[PDB]
Amino acid sequence: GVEVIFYLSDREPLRLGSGEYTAEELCIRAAQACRISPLCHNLFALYDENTKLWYAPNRTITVDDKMSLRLHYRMRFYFTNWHGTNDNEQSVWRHSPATPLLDASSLEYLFAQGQYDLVKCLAPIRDPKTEQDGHDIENECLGMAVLAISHYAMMKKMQLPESYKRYIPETLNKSIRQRNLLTRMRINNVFKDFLKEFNNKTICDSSVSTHDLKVKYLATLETLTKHYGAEIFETSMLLISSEGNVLYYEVMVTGNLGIQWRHKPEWNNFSYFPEITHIVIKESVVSINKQDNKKMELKLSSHEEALSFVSLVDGYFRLTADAHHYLCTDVAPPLIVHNIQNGCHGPICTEYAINKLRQEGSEEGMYVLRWSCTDFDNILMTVTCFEKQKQFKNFQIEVQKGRYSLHGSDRSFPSLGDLMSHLKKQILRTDNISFMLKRCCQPKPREISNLLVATKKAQE
Template sequence: MYKYLSTLEHLAPRFGTETFLAAQLELRKDGGDGSGSYLNTSHAHGASDPGNVGPQVMHEVMVSGTKGIQWRKMTVQNQSPLQQEPNSSDTWTSFCDFPEISHITITGANVSIFKQDNFSMEVQMNSSLEALSFVSLLDGYFRLTADAHHYLCHEVAPPRVVLSATNGLHGPMNDDFVLQRLRKEAVEEGAFLVRWSVLDYHRIILAVLNKSQVNNGQAAIHKQFRILHSGSVFSLEGWDREFSSVKELTDSLKTFVLKSGTDNFTVKKCCLPRPAELSNLLVMRQGADQCVQPDSVALCLTQLRFHQIKDKEITQEQHLGRGTRTNIYSGSLLVRGGAEEEEEDEEDKWNNNLTDCKEIRVVLKILDQSHKDVALAFFETASLMSQVSHSHLVFVHGVSVKGSENIMVEEFVEFGPLDVFLRRERALVTPQWKFTVAKQLASALGYLETKQLVHGNVCAKNILVARRGLEEGTFPFVKLSDPGIALNVLSREG
């Protein structure tokens, strides 16, 4: 077997990869709605361009089952179509692995791949059929390596996956994973999940856990009831009623008690599929899954982590308002010169003194001294926001302790809270403006979900406007601020 695999690997060095020739490729930051900026723009002349007499600069995109999406520039000599041979000039550059993709859109031959960190790749294929093939490949690899129950693009979504997503169905999970998931939900009465059968392609299985036995310290017992799927109707085996959806069927069962021998089972709490849920449906790739999807790794919430800022490095200025147990001021922060100061003389770049410092505008959130009992929650919020990084999340520079004052130092967002902005600019705000803002907010919340975090205080006053986007040809840009001190902490105050 080893010799066979070694020979196969030698004969097919790119086994498990597929390459596509792209006429145009662009990398963008902050999505593809025009609200962001281009990181790399390379327009290529198509092969049919009659005015193109020199070598054509194009792109090659490679999809690998172990390395995700990679791309490189290449040149094609201007010959007849049958004689054209690509000459690669650049090494492969990684764009992302499959678990990092949030969604894909396709319009004709144009494909847009969006990552969870709001970066995107815009690719123009040579035909709409090739674009569909490209997206289908990415969609399939995503379900194999990241989330077996989710599709990235409506145009290529398999009907069975759409049916499963609509009805909250798990894939054909093995019994061990089914029982493991039900045990996690055993704190609630009537935990159940619905999955496709491992043995019968057209059969659905309703798995229900007996909670009473778990509470009594006995081995958990779960029973499986068969659901028949015929055409567009679903029916529980042994029950003559038919339903148009699995959800309608399980909702009806909530008023009944299911019996299996001497055991009774109730159907109350549905265990829906979760993103990247561990099961036999995902392929674990050696050397790949340890480093992919860094955004999905849970943060360290058991200890405080933030940058400590010296009190002499901040200057307090105008009072802007009040937050949750805080007073908010504008201010400035003294920072050391770094990579951003590209116009400095070479001698100054290596000069280790304070002349390299500059001031940047910041917001200072000062905890009210009469509420020192919530100081720990204040620091926990600062620690949480210091560990996340997204273009639509407000950046936290760190925390400063100035005497008895605890200060959170955040980036200054020019046009302030969304609620105030909307009242002021109501006449100029269009539905497209609101849609763009909603997309940006959704991308920030989606990022937090990959970190297994819940913001808990999404409201207009916590959404800050960085760019107005009211002028022709411009787009708004918003940032979600920190959630403040949690309500459960405030309820214990005093």
């Protein structure tokens, strides 16, 4: 059958009945299953580990009783040094009226994923500069096995139960199992030394939480593995406006650096996300257009690979330039689109909604619509009111299978705009205050909120 798999051990896959789905609908189910907040939801997408391709949020999955498919729910959009523990590097936070990027469930989810990446060699270890470095990398792998084990024990409330082999990359395990007996026993013993030294001495001596262990591990993947958080795409045809054997290039996309490229053998910068105006897909060909009329065109394997590429650029654009807008119709997320058609914000903090009313909704009845910060089933309406002396009130709107109803009501509507028209014919009240709805203060292009990530390059 068709399943969405989780990297978390304690979690049952999603088993999908026959029917029609959106990738996004599935990612929403997935976040509910893994306790991922609406705020972190758009960091995740569906990945097919066999095809090596990501699904765009608007992709349709028609499931019958014949089809067999395994998708992984996976964190896709990533910002090096989100954790703030590398002092050589720009830190990366959300805007604030600066908060952390990840919620606790996202961190837990990422830890499971990162472990899987390391062991299954999706996150390949870096290459040695020397035999000395080679051994050094290998020791860092052992340390990683100590973090993994220590954390698993602190989670089950254990202490000294009773090896490293399943917690290190599989390629490296294979490598070690082919070395001489004394080598293999030496390695095992150094590992046992690290482990004992950590759990007796280091943990108590530094009050190390399961949270620090998760952070440390993921911060270490960044420096231990190759291009952690990057996606690299391979192409024959790369055309750039600014600038025989079939020549070969790589295009790399990262949250922190944007869209870079090189001759397949260092990286040239084409563009950060906010400078992009639009993206076009022509079968397998992708053109990325910048504000300065410069263009990158590239040709990928298939249209599905093109959609996977553009999903990524587009997701990072929403994260760094504009939370409410999209670059390419072909991968536009259905929720993004509908929100635009309805004047609705994403899960902005209440203070941003209030600030927008203090600026452009000064009269009684002016409102903001915003998705709830804590669940996926409700929209909030924030309204300017006055006593008889300006107040802000919040009213809950339920959304259930495309139906919209005020909280508690037996009356629902087939669209949000229907519900709003009906509400605009009433006198509303709460506490002592009565008023009628005036107009919607809609999302503005490029405005700043907690949905955006404040990276070095996003400041311009």
